[PDB]
Write a protein that holds these residues in place. Structure first.
Motif, PDB file in Angstrom:
ATOM      1  N   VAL A   1      14.108  32.610  44.857  1.00  0.00           N
ATOM      2  CA  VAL A   1      13.603  31.779  43.759  1.00  0.00           C
ATOM      3  C   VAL A   1      14.277  30.428  43.887  1.00  0.00           C
ATOM      4  O   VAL A   1      15.515  30.351  44.020  1.00  0.00           O
ATOM      5  CB  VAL A   1      13.928  32.376  42.378  1.00  0.00           C
ATOM      6  N   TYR A   2      13.474  29.373  43.861  1.00  0.00           N
ATOM      7  CA  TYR A   2      13.973  28.038  44.220  1.00  0.00           C
ATOM      8  C   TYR A   2      12.979  26.939  43.854  1.00  0.00           C
ATOM      9  O   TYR A   2      11.819  27.225  43.607  1.00  0.00           O
ATOM     10  CB  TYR A   2      14.314  28.003  45.725  1.00  0.00           C
ATOM     11  N   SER A   3      13.408  25.665  43.863  1.00  0.00           N
ATOM     12  CA  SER A   3      12.486  24.551  43.569  1.00  0.00           C
ATOM     13  C   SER A   3      11.872  23.914  44.838  1.00  0.00           C
ATOM     14  O   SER A   3      12.522  23.918  45.894  1.00  0.00           O
ATOM     15  CB  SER A   3      13.217  23.478  42.752  1.00  0.00           C
ATOM     16  N   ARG A   4      10.646  23.394  44.724  1.00  0.00           N
ATOM     17  CA  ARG A   4       9.922  22.707  45.808  1.00  0.00           C
ATOM     18  C   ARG A   4      10.687  21.476  46.298  1.00  0.00           C
ATOM     19  O   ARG A   4      10.861  21.242  47.525  1.00  0.00           O
ATOM     20  CB  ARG A   4       8.512  22.292  45.343  1.00  0.00           C
ATOM     21  N   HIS A   5      11.109  20.659  45.332  1.00  0.00           N
ATOM     22  CA  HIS A   5      11.871  19.457  45.613  1.00  0.00           C
ATOM     23  C   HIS A   5      13.248  19.629  45.005  1.00  0.00           C
ATOM     24  O   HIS A   5      13.425  20.488  44.124  1.00  0.00           O
ATOM     25  CB  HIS A   5      11.166  18.230  44.996  1.00  0.00           C
TER      26      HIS A   5
ATOM     27  N   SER B   1       9.364  16.002  37.206  1.00  0.00           N
ATOM     28  CA  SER B   1       8.347  17.026  37.454  1.00  0.00           C
ATOM     29  C   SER B   1       8.621  17.655  38.809  1.00  0.00           C
ATOM     30  O   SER B   1       9.012  16.965  39.746  1.00  0.00           O
ATOM     31  CB  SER B   1       6.966  16.384  37.467  1.00  0.00           C
ATOM     32  N   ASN B   2       8.396  18.965  38.920  1.00  0.00           N
ATOM     33  CA  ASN B   2       8.758  19.702  40.128  1.00  0.00           C
ATOM     34  C   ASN B   2       7.969  21.004  40.165  1.00  0.00           C
ATOM     35  O   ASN B   2       7.080  21.197  39.349  1.00  0.00           O
ATOM     36  CB  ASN B   2      10.249  19.990  40.079  1.00  0.00           C
TER      37      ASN B   2
ATOM     38  N   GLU C   1       4.275  24.484  38.132  1.00  0.00           N
ATOM     39  CA  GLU C   1       4.856  23.178  37.843  1.00  0.00           C
ATOM     40  C   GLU C   1       5.839  23.358  36.701  1.00  0.00           C
ATOM     41  O   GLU C   1       5.585  24.114  35.759  1.00  0.00           O
ATOM     42  CB  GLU C   1       3.784  22.131  37.491  1.00  0.00           C
ATOM     43  N   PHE C   2       6.979  22.696  36.812  1.00  0.00           N
ATOM     44  CA  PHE C   2       7.957  22.698  35.731  1.00  0.00           C
ATOM     45  C   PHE C   2       8.759  21.421  35.758  1.00  0.00           C
ATOM     46  O   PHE C   2       8.795  20.719  36.767  1.00  0.00           O
ATOM     47  CB  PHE C   2       8.825  23.973  35.750  1.00  0.00           C
ATOM     48  N   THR C   3       9.367  21.111  34.624  1.00  0.00           N
ATOM     49  CA  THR C   3      10.303  20.016  34.549  1.00  0.00           C
ATOM     50  C   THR C   3      11.606  20.634  34.122  1.00  0.00           C
ATOM     51  O   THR C   3      11.752  21.050  32.960  1.00  0.00           O
ATOM     52  CB  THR C   3       9.864  18.949  33.557  1.00  0.00           C
ATOM     53  N   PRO C   4      12.565  20.707  35.058  1.00  0.00           N
ATOM     54  CA  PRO C   4      13.869  21.244  34.742  1.00  0.00           C
ATOM     55  C   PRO C   4      14.488  20.474  33.571  1.00  0.00           C
ATOM     56  O   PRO C   4      14.371  19.246  33.502  1.00  0.00           O
ATOM     57  CB  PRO C   4      14.682  20.974  36.005  1.00  0.00           C
ATOM     58  N   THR C   5      15.080  21.213  32.640  1.00  0.00           N
ATOM     59  CA  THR C   5      15.946  20.637  31.615  1.00  0.00           C
ATOM     60  C   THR C   5      17.298  21.307  31.803  1.00  0.00           C
ATOM     61  O   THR C   5      17.437  22.187  32.653  1.00  0.00           O
ATOM     62  CB  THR C   5      15.434  20.905  30.191  1.00  0.00           C
ATOM     63  N   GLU C   6      18.288  20.894  31.013  1.00  0.00           N
ATOM     64  CA  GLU C   6      19.655  21.407  31.134  1.00  0.00           C
ATOM     65  C   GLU C   6      19.826  22.846  30.627  1.00  0.00           C
ATOM     66  O   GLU C   6      20.634  23.603  31.172  1.00  0.00           O
ATOM     67  CB  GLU C   6      20.635  20.450  30.426  1.00  0.00           C
ATOM     68  N   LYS C   7      19.064  23.222  29.601  1.00  0.00           N
ATOM     69  CA  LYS C   7      19.275  24.507  28.915  1.00  0.00           C
ATOM     70  C   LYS C   7      18.311  25.632  29.314  1.00  0.00           C
ATOM     71  O   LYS C   7      18.584  26.802  29.040  1.00  0.00           O
ATOM     72  CB  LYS C   7      19.235  24.322  27.392  1.00  0.00           C
ATOM     73  N   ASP C   8      17.174  25.275  29.909  1.00  0.00           N
ATOM     74  CA  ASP C   8      16.135  26.260  30.242  1.00  0.00           C
ATOM     75  C   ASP C   8      16.560  27.089  31.440  1.00  0.00           C
ATOM     76  O   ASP C   8      16.985  26.544  32.447  1.00  0.00           O
ATOM     77  CB  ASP C   8      14.806  25.559  30.530  1.00  0.00           C
ATOM     78  N   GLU C   9      16.454  28.409  31.311  1.00  0.00           N
ATOM     79  CA  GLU C   9      16.768  29.312  32.407  1.00  0.00           C
ATOM     80  C   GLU C   9      15.470  29.878  32.972  1.00  0.00           C
ATOM     81  O   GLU C   9      14.537  30.197  32.227  1.00  0.00           O
ATOM     82  CB  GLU C   9      17.691  30.444  31.946  1.00  0.00           C
ATOM     83  N   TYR C  10      15.415  29.992  34.292  1.00  0.00           N
ATOM     84  CA  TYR C  10      14.182  30.444  34.964  1.00  0.00           C
ATOM     85  C   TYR C  10      14.486  31.601  35.898  1.00  0.00           C
ATOM     86  O   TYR C  10      15.581  31.736  36.397  1.00  0.00           O
ATOM     87  CB  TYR C  10      13.549  29.297  35.759  1.00  0.00           C
ATOM     88  N   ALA C  11      13.489  32.436  36.133  1.00  0.00           N
ATOM     89  CA  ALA C  11      13.691  33.607  36.965  1.00  0.00           C
ATOM     90  C   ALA C  11      12.365  34.040  37.560  1.00  0.00           C
ATOM     91  O   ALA C  11      11.295  33.550  37.166  1.00  0.00           O
ATOM     92  CB  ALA C  11      14.307  34.728  36.140  1.00  0.00           C
ATOM     93  N   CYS C  12      12.427  34.957  38.516  1.00  0.00           N
ATOM     94  CA  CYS C  12      11.210  35.585  39.007  1.00  0.00           C
ATOM     95  C   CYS C  12      11.349  37.079  38.762  1.00  0.00           C
ATOM     96  O   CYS C  12      12.413  37.630  38.980  1.00  0.00           O
ATOM     97  CB  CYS C  12      11.039  35.288  40.501  1.00  0.00           C
TER      98      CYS C  12
END
Lengths: 99, 274, 9
Positions: A9-13, A20-21, A69-80
């Motif tokens: 699990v990782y970002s495109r850019h 935006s990412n 598509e997502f825009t990373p913020t400081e508090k949001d946690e993401y997972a797969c």
């Protein structure tokens, strides 16, 4: 034969807050092809998720890229979150940006 | 060079009603350029790279005709294989096929390949010389006899050595702006402390194309493989690839370790230190 | 450019 998926699990850019990412969940090495993949934001299922066309490696194992598509913020946690015949319970892999 | 064209096909049977789910994808090198998905509404081969959109309606008519025919071949195969292996109608089974051609830097034929699997296991494949077959078991040996009598290898060899290469060349020219461009890896190093005495160095390669790359660690100029982790190369999703390799090191000794990167897009091998 | 298959197993 039944082969368990590997998950990354990782970002495109490069991931920068406010920009935006795309968030990727790359699942590979699995057989058979039926697989359930969800991307989670703060534990909740992301609705707008697309995926690549099923393909496979020389060893016949399948791979798929799921992305949103997502825009990373400081508090949001993401997972797969992935389920497959080979998994007794769904597997969750958290996005770790500092990697 | 080198370059390749490859097609991948997957059919998965659907017990209880109707035809298998069939998905076909074509690649030039690491770039997908066409796809067909039986579950999609268009029922046409669809472009997936802007350079293939140069091809006219006749190309698309032709590829759609061939890929639908391919799908029927797999539909029949799934039934035949169920018979060969004495399986019931209850379960889903899969057939996979891949074929294609590799050319060298001069764009001349190097190698061709054609392989088939049933339920994820080798079934039958063309041998390296494209003149005979490798059959994994007795069911596949029955298929080999059939394909020998029908001179299938001869048809495939003609395609792989001729048409496959000729069309690969055409695509390489039409798609030159991206297909013939190499994107060198963009590299950096990260550092993390697990404890007072142990640190992890991670060497990152991002944004590279094609996917082939070598990342390695050295300690005081010598190859270091112990206490390393190397992730599988992964797609960025924008056409490029990413990879990293990590090493665990005693805190304070980071300077002994260097990461070395080899890639087509790098005229000189690259070195990073912390 | 796809090859005509057509040979079933």
């Amino acid at each position: 034969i039944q082969r368990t998926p590997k998950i990354q699990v990782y970002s495109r850019h490069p991931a920068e807050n406010g920009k935006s990412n795309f968030l990727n969940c790359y699942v590979s090495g699995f057989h058979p092809s039926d697989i359930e993949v969800d991307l989670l934001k703060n534990g909740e299922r992301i609705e707008k998720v697309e995926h690549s066309d099923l393909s496979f490696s020389k060893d016949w194992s399948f791979y798929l890229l799921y992305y949103t598509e997502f825009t990373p913020t400081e508090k949001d946690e993401y997972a797969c979150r992935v389920n497959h015949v080979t998994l007794s319970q769904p597997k969750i892999v958290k996005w770790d940006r500092d990697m | 060079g080198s370059h390749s064209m490859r097609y991948f096909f997957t059919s998965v049977s659907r017990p209880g009603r109707g035809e298998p789910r069939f998905i076909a994808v074509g690649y030039v090198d690491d770039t997908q350029f066409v796809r067909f998905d039986s579950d999609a509404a268009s029922q046409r081969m669809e472009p997936r790279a802007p350079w293939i959109e140069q091809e006219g309606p006749e190309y698309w008519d032709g590829e759609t005709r061939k890929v639908k025919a391919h799908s029927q071949t797999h539909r029949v195969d799934l039934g035949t294989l169920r018979g060969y292996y004495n399986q019931s109608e209850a379960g889903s089974h899969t057939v996979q096929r891949m074929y294609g051609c590799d050319v060298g830097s001069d764009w001349r034929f190097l190698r061709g390949y054609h392989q088939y699997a049933y339920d994820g296991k080798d079934y039958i494949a063309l041998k390296e010389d494209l003149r005979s077959w490798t059959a994994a078991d007795m069911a596949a040996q029955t298929t080999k006899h059939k394909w020998e009598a029908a001179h299938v290898a001869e048809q495939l060899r003609a395609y792989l050595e001729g048409t496959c290469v000729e069309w690969l060349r055409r695509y390489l020219e039409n798609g030159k702006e991206t297909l013939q461009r190499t994107d060198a890896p963009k590299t950096h190093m990260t550092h993390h402390a697990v404890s007072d005495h142990e640190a992890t160095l991670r060497c990152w390669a991002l944004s590279f194309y094609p996917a082939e790359i070598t990342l390695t660690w050295q300690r005081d100029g010598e190859d270091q493989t112990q206490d390393t982790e190397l992730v599988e190369t992964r797609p960025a999703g924008d056409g490029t690839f990413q990879k990293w390799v990590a090493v665990v090191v005693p805190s304070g000794q980071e300077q002994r370790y260097t990461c070395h990167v080899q890639h087509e897009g790098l005229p000189k091998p690259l070195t990073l230190r912390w | 450019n796809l090859v005509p298959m057509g040979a079933t197993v």
